[PDB]
Design an enzyme around this catalytic site. Structure first.
Site: not given
Ligand SMILES: O=C(Nc1cccnc1)Nc1cccc(Cl)c1
Ligand SMILES: O=C(Nc1cccnc1)Nc1cccc(Cl)c1
Lengths: 304, 304
Positions: B145, B143, B41
């Protein structure tokens, strides 16, 4: 989101761990620049530990008697000196892995990460608070002595604790990196009174703000309190008295959530007088006091 | 003595963290040998995340569009490929800090350490369990990820998890290092049902053995139970059914304490039916399930 008892990344400290052997005792040392720091009880035997005369025991030791090993390489000891309860072994090679570092004496209620080690090798890392009574509730076995506690500000490791002993009660005692014990403890195999401990009020409040930021809000109520009224409840439940300095330190968390510090104190007052009623806060069924307001802001903001 | 939620020393994993940027998105990558692994992503924008066509989005990207930075040095990307939900960026330089490593897919109920990172920099380390429902209750911000989960056996890092997303419920979802999600999750900004979670029975029992070893014995009783009787209680309290495999894994802890596994099951049965009665076990007011029998033996024996 989410809130965990997070330790600092231990890499910079792992690069400093060495094994120190003297006679039949082996423990951990911290190698910074051309100096290896370790608990002075490395020079004792089982017959000595009841009341060691460290000055006398150290006189029978020479540079060649302190075996320092960093992984597979042996360090050459060119000097030895006792500073309070720590031995400083001057070695001929500066540690190439020495990070930017400071020696600091932390205050009770402050937190730090511990890198538990055995035979100079790291086994694990965990976050600790220095209890108001200067003990730490760690996880240490025989051989863990010399493991250190630290904090990291970007690239600088502030070493604050070195492990020396387990009291008969199972709690832990140690020194700053100048060999000064935290608390009234002495490095002797004797029963030693740890004073009355209290709960770190400012930390519990910081953790209640962390709960609000992360969605756990059930404990918030329609009440407020004063520092005086709250402190009577804190007195009754063996909580540290709250001061304006503590309220001031909670300022950023108060500003972010919009919940005035005295309003959060009234939530805490109700949790102390009524308990949790079988509920949890951030996965805990008790009031957590091992996160400072700084730890909460750092974890909730993502400081690396 | 003492028992803590201990993470592995993170040094070997810190040496692998890099920053990956594609377009306007920045996240973490893991640099092992001449390959950088990161969530796919990284190639999306806010308009794409509702239902990204990753195959199409990746086609518009070239090697020069993936900016990989390891501290202050820029890595040269010579290949890119998508494997399930991870991007593999071939770089021209092998990571000099690559440790001995494996990619493993952990089982639900197993534990691991997470090194939370932002912009390729480590912020902290904590111990996690993969929930029976394949979610993890971590601490991650936007951030984070690309942060990874791992275990260490002496010098070999077994990477088991890469962080991909926070579900609308605040729990976390991610993949193994081949890009396969743990659980039914998909990398889309959509509401996604996490299945019913249960408590990891074998871990709670392992932690009850850890309590006994460390002096907390109040919960031990004069009763015993059978696997069938215990499993009816486990069913009622949303606990994973206990099998003979679980009893077998608890063998070492049973041998060390002299408390038969079914006797410990009867202690757990009474704690489930009566609660704690305002008492604690190893500093907790609830039944802890994020320590495996292996974690307990390792912590109580001092494996480095
Ligand atoms: O969750 C996402 N980011 C995040 C934010 C807070 C804590 N952990 C991760 N971003 C994302 C948004 C939608 C789908 C996917 Cl795969 C990724
Ligand atoms: O406690 C000592 N070791 C130990 C064991 C378990 C956990 N932590 C430490 N050794 C010691 C014995 C008597 C006085 C002094 Cl200073 C040190």
């Amino acid at each position: 989101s989410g809130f965990r008892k997070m330790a600092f990344p231990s890499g910079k400290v792992e690069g400093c761990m060495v094994q120190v052997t003297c006679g039949t005792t082996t423990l951990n040392g911290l190698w910074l620049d051309d100096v290896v720091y370790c608990p002075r009880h490395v020079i004792c035997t089982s017959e000595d530990m009841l009341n060691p005369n460290y000055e006398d025991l150290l006189i029978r030791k020479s540079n060649h008697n302190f075996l320092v090993q960093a992984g597979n390489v042996q360090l050459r000891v060119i000097g030895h000196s006792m500073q309070n309860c720590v031995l400083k072994l001057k070695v001929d090679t500066a540690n190439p892995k020495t990070p930017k570092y400071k020696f600091v004496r932390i205050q009770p209620g402050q937190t730090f990460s511990v890198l538990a080690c055995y035979n100079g090798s790291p086994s694990g890392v965990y976050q600790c608070a220095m209890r108001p009574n200067f003990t730490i509730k760690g996880s240490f076995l025989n051989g863990s002595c010399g493991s250190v506690g630290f904090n990291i500000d970007y690239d600088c490791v502030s070493f604050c604790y070195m492990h020396h002993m387990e009291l008969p009660t199972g709690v832990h005692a140690g020194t700053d990196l100048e060999g000064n014990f935290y608390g009234p403890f002495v490095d002797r195999q004797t029963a030693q009174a740890a004073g009355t401990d209290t709960t770190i009020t400012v930390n519990v409040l910081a953790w209640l703000y962390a709960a609000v930021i992360n969605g756990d809000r059930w404990f918030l109520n329609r009440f407020t309190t004063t520092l005086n009224d709250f402190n009577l409840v804190a007195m009754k439940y063996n909580y540290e008295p709250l001061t304006q300095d503590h309220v001031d330190i909670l300022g950023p968390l108060s500003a972010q959530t919009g919940i005035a510090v005295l309003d959060m104190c009234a939530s805490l007052k109700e949790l102390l007088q009524n308990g949790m009623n079988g509920r949890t806060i951030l996965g805990s069924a008790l009031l957590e006091d091992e996160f400072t307001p700084f730890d909460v802001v750092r974890q909730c903001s993502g400081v690396t």
